[PDB]
Design a protein around this ligand. Structure first.
Ligand SMILES: O=C(O)[C@@H]1CC[C@H](Oc2ccccc2)C[C@@H]1COc1cccc(Cl)c1
Length: 134
């Protein structure tokens, strides 16, 4: 057993708060905000050795990232940003920092009861996205 055991599995989005304002802060345009904001993604998290994989599947876009903790990688986000990402574990929370165009956003993922809670922060704006097991 290991580092991210409690994150592994298949998860479905059940609630979202303040996501449009977060996307606006990130710089997402109108049409993408509308379509992306409708989506109810499934997130599939797996671990193989040191490599963590997070897949998301939705009506809007499918994305996939594989990474080693602390080791920067290139990511294409669902809104088509080309970012440089670093993901670490801080006290049981996955902390994902994305850098692009001189900007930065942080996504934190934690287990809370039977949920996986995703908090997305850009400057002073937070969005909270809650997932349940699928
Ligand atoms: O897990 C979440 O809900 C985070 C939400 C913010 C980030 O994504 C963003 C998505 C759109 C705009 C800005 C940022 C990462 C993940 C969600 O990734 C996906 C992947 C494919 C399709 C969809 Cl619709 C969302």
């Amino acid at each position: 057993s290991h580092m991210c055991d409690a994150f592994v599995g298949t998860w479905k989005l059940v609630s979202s708060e303040n996501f449009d304002d977060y996307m606006k802060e990130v710089g997402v345009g109108f049409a993408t905000r509308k379509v992306a904001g409708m989506a109810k993604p499934n997130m599939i998290i797996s671990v193989n050795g040191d490599v963590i994989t997070i897949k998301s599947e939705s009506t809007f876009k499918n994305t996939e990232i594989s990474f080693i903790l602390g080791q920067e990688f290139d990511e294409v986000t669902a809104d088509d940003r080309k970012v440089k990402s670093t993901i670490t574990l801080d006290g049981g929370v996955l902390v994902h920092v994305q850098k692009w165009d001189g900007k930065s956003t942080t996504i934190k993922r934690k287990r809370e009861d039977d949920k996986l809670v995703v908090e997305c922060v850009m400057k002073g704006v937070t969005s909270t996205r809650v997932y349940e097991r699928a």
